[PDB]
C-alpha cells in the first residue's frame, strides 16, 4: 500500500471483477475520441485512459453489442419536407444575419461619413462627421470585430441546428424492430442519421400535471414528443396519419406509451386502497 | 433547486448533504459555518470546554478568559495548540479545554455531542435562482430569495462508493434497491406509529387543545373543500389525459 | 397500481421494467430523475474523475484542453519577453540608441510618420502610403 | 522527466506535458481507435 498516503485496505478491484455495462446495447464511440481530434492532438476528458479506468464498474464498449442487428426493416414515420423547411429557415436566417450584421454596418460605417440619427440623437454635441482612419491607432477593433463575427456566426449556426435537432425527418425500424434509425436535420439542412433502442423510447407525461391541456398533442395535427431515456433526447413526430405507416404504428404506440397511465390523474375513493401492495410483517 | 443527490453529489456535495440530513457531529463539524460557532460553557476540570476536530490530531485555540458583559473578553487573546489526549488549560485564566476528535461513525459517543452544534442551515443548499440581492440594507445578512419551492419528500439513504457506481450504471439494480428502501421506509413509519399508539395508550394524551369553535368549524370546512377540489382536479385530469391513458 | 404490462425487447435485461408500477418508474425515471432515468450514468463517473484529479489546468472549452502548441508558445514568449524587460530596464539603459529602436505608426489621415517603416529593413526600403479619409 | 520514468503513459492522453526523453504516447500520431 502507499506507505505515505494509503491504508492496508487498498486492494484494487481487478478488471475481471468489475461490473460489466448492461444498461444499453448501443456502443458509445465517444470514449475512442475522433480521428479529427486525435489528428489535432486535442485532449478530451471523455477519452482519457485514466478517467476511463473506472475502479468499480466498466465503461460501455465503443462498438454496439454483438446481439444487435442493424439490417433495415419497416419504415415507421416519414416527413421528408421538414428538410426543405429546415434549409429555407436556415438559409433565410443566414441571409438575414448577413444583411443585418455585415452589409448594413459596412455600408453605414465605411461607405459614408455622415452619421445616422441614432448615433447622436441623445447627445448634445454639434453635428459632425466621422472617419474610419482618425481613431483607434493601435487597432484593437480588428480582433474584436473578427471575434464577434466568428463567434456570433458559430452561435447562430449551432443554436439553429440545436432547435431543429429534436424533429424527426424519418424513422425506420430494424428488421427485428429492436432499433429505430432516425434521420434528422443536419446543420446545413440535409440528413444526418442516428440510432435509438425502442426499449428506451417513452412518451413521458409532463412534470406539471396542469400543463397537459397546453400540449401540442392535444390537437389532431399537433406534435408528439417521445423521449429517448438512455440519452435524454427528443423525437418530435407529426401526429398526422399521412406521415405514419399503419403496419407498425400501433405497435410503436403500444411500446412507447407505458408511463402515461391512469395514476397520473390520481386515485379515486376506490383505487386509493390499491395504490400500493401491503407489506405483511411477522407472518413468517 | 435541491440537488438530485443520486447522480450529482459525489464527495464534498455528498458530505455536505450528509451533514445536513444526519447532523452527525463529524459531518456537522466539517461543514459548520465559519460565521458563528455555538457558544459554550466555561472550561472546568469537571466540565471542560470541548473543542471539536474532524479526525485531526490538534487545533489552534485562542482563549480570552472569562468573558463578561462590560468587556466582551476577560483577558488578552492567547493562542495555543490544543492537542489530542488529555485535558489542557490556559494558565492565564485556568479554563480547561478538551479536544474531542470526532470519528466518522454512528456510535452513541458521537451522539453525546449532538447538542454542541448549530443545526446546518439549508438556505444555501441546492441551487440558487438569484445571484445576489442588490439592496444595500439587506445584503451579506439575508439569503437570496427563490422563485421555486423546496420539496420535503426526500428520504436520503447512504450507499458505499462501489454500490453508488453500480446504481449509476445499472438502472435495474437502482430500481430494485429503491423499491426495497421504499418498503423499508413504510415498515419504519408503521413501527413508529405503533410505538406512538402504545405510548399514548399507556400514558394518555398530553392535554387538551385550546381552539375556537369558529376555527374548528373552519378546519372541517377547509378539509371538505380540499376533498371537493381534489375530486374536481381528478375529473379534469382524467378528461385532459383521455387520449393518452 | 398500473403495472408495466410488457417489454417487447429480446434483451432479457429490459425485463426489469415489468416488475414496477408506472408511477414508481415515473418518479425515479422521470420528473426529478429525468436526467438519469433508464440511462447508465458512466459519463458522470468519468467526468467526476476528470474534475477531481490534478489534470492540466489549461482548458480551452468544456470538452478539450488548450492545444499544447498555444500553451508552449505563450509560456516561452512570456518568459523570454519578461527576461528582456528586466535585463534591459536594469542593465542596458546607458545607451538608449544601442539597446532600443524608435518605432511609430500614425493614422491614415495624417501623412506617413518618419518612424513608420519596417524595422531591420531600413537599408532596403522606404515605406510610405497614400492618405485616406 | 529526464532519464527517469516517473509518469505512466498508459494513464495520459498526451505524454509531453513536460520536457522528457523517456515517454511515448500509447496512441501515437498515426493511431486512431475506431469502431
Amino acid at each position: 500500500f502507499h506507505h505515505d498516503k494509503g491504508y492496508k485496505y487498498d486492494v484494487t478491484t481487478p478488471y475481471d471483477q468489475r461490473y460489466n455495462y448492461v444498461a444499453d446495447r448501443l456502443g458509445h464511440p465517444e470514449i475512442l475520441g475522433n480521428p479529427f481530434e486525435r489528428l489535432m492532438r486535442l485532449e478530451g476528458d471523455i477519452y482519457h485512459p485514466n478517467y476511463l479506468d473506472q475502479p468499480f464498474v466498466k465503461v460501455p464498449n465503443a462498438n454496439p453489442n454483438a446481439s444487435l442487428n442493424f439490417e433495415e426493416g419497416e419504415v415507421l414515420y416519414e416527413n421528408t419536407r421538414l428538410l426543405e423547411w429546415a434549409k429555407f429557415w436556415n438559409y433565410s436566417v443566414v441571409v438575414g444575419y448577413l444583411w443585418c450584421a455585415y452589409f448594413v454596418p459596412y455600408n453605414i460605417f465605411f461607405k459614408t461619413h455622415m452619421p445616422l440619427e441614432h448615433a447622436y440623437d441623445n447627445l448634445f454635441f454639434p453635428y459632425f462627421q466621422h472617419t474610419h482612419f482618425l481613431w483607434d491607432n493601435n487597432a484593437l477593433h480588428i480582433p474584436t470585430v473578427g471575434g464577434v463575427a466568428i463567434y456570433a456566426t458559430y452561435i447562430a449556426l449551432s443554436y439553429i441546428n440545436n432547435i431543429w435537432k429534436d424533429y424527426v425527418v424519418r424513422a425506420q425500424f430494424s428488421k427485428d424492430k429492436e432499433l429505430l434509425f432516425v434521420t434528422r436535420v443536419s446543420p446545413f439542412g440535409t440528413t444526418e442519421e442516428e440510432v435509438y433502442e425502442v426499449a428506451h423510447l417513452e412518451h413521458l407525461p409532463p412534470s406539471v400535471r396542469s400543463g397537459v391541456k397546453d400540449l401540442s398533442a392535444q390537437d389532431a395535427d399537433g406534435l408528439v414528443d417521445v423521449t429517448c431515456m438512455s440519452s435524454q433526447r427528443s423525437l418530435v413526430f407529426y401526429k398526422g396519419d399521412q406521415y405514419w405507416n399503419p403496419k407498425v404504428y400501433n405497435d410503436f404506440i403500444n411500446q412507447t406509451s407505458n408511463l402515461w397511465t391512469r395514476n397520473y390523474t390520481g386515485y379515486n375513493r376506490l383505487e386509493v386502497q390499491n395504490s400500493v401492495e401491503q407489506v405483511k410483517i411477522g407472518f413468517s | 433547486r435541491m440537488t438530485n443527490t443520486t447522480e450529482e453529489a459525489f464527495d464534498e456535495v455528498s458530505h455536505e448533504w450528509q451533514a445536513l440530513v444526519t447532523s452527525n457531529p463529524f459531518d456537522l463539524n466539517v461543514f459548520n459555518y465559519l460565521e458563528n460557532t455555538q457558544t459554550s460553557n466555561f472550561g472546568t476540570v469537571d466540565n471542560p470546554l470541548v473543542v471539536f476536530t474532524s479526525e485531526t490530531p490538534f487545533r489552534y485555540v485562542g482563549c480570552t478568559g472569562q468573558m463578561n458583559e462590560d468587556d466582551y473578553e476577560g483577558h488578552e487573546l492567547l493562542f495555543f495548540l490544543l492537542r489530542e489526549g488529555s485535558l489542557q488549560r490556559c494558565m492565564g485564566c485556568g479554563q480547561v479545554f478538551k479536544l474531542v476528535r470526532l470519528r466518522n461513525e454512528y456510535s452513541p459517543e458521537m451522539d453525546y455531542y449532538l447538542s454542541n452544534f448549530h443545526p446546518y442551515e439549508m438556505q444555501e443548499m441546492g441551487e440558487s435562482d438569484t445571484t445576489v440581492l442588490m439592496s444595500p440594507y439587506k445584503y451579506a445578512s439575508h439569503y437570496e430569495y427563490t422563485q421555486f419551492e423546496t420539496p420535503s419528500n426526500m428520504v436520503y439513504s447512504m450507499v458505499n462508493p462501489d454500490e453508488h457506481d453500480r446504481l449509476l450504471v445499472d438502472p435495474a439494480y437502482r430500481m430494485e434497491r429503491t423499491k426495497a428502501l421504499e418498503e423499508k421506509y413504510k415498515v419504519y413509519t408503521s413501527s413508529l406509529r405503533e410505538v406512538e399508539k402504545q405510548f399514548e395508550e399507556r400514558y394518555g394524551r398530553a392535554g387538551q387543545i385550546n381552539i375556537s369553535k369558529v376555527t374548528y368549524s373552519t378546519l372541517i370546512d377547509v378539509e371538505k373543500a380540499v376533498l371537493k377540489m381534489d375530486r374536481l382536479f381528478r375529473k379534469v385530469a382524467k378528461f385532459e389525459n383521455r387520449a393518452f391513458i | 397500481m398500473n403495472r408495466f404490462f410488457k417489454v417487447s425487447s429480446k434483451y432479457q435485461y429490459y425485463k426489469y421494467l415489468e416488475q414496477y408500477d408506472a408511477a414508481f418508474l415515473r418518479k425515479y425515471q422521470s420528473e426529478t430523475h429525468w436526467y438519469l432515468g433508464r440511462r447508465g450514468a458512466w459519463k458522470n463517473l468519468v467526468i467526476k474523475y476528470a474534475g477531481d484529479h490534478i489534470s492540466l489546468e489549461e482548458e480551452h472549452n468544456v470538452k478539450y484542453k488548450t492545444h499544447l502548441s498555444f500553451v508552449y508558445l505563450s509560456y516561452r514568449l512570456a518568459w523570454v519577453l519578461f527576461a528582456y524587460v528586466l535585463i534591459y530596464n536594469h542593465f542596458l539603459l546607458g545607451d538608449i540608441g544601442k539597446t532600443f529602436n524608435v518605432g511609430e505608426w500614425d493614422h491614415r489621415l495624417k501623412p506617413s510618420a518618419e518612424r513608420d517603416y519596417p524595422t531591420r529593413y531600413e537599408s532596403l526600403y522606404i515605406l510610405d502610403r497614400t492618405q485616406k479619409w | 522527466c529526464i532519464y527517469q520514468a516517473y509518469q505512466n503513459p498508459l494513464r495520459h492522453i498526451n505524454t509531453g506535458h513536460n520536457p522528457n526523453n523517456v515517454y511515448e504516447d500509447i496512441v501515437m500520431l498515426g493511431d486512431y481507435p475506431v469502431q
Binding site: 491504508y7 487498498d10 407489506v279 410483517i281 | 450507499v159 426495497a180 423499508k184 415498515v187 408503521s190 | - | 494513464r11
Partner: peptide
Amino acid sequence: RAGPYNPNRYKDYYIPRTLPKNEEIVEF
C-alpha cells in the same frame, strides 16, 4: 518515490451492504 495515489479507487465499508428485515425493523 511512491507512485500516484487515488483513494477513491478503493472500496470503503461505512454502510452495511445488506438491508434490514421488516420484522427486525419493527422489533428494533
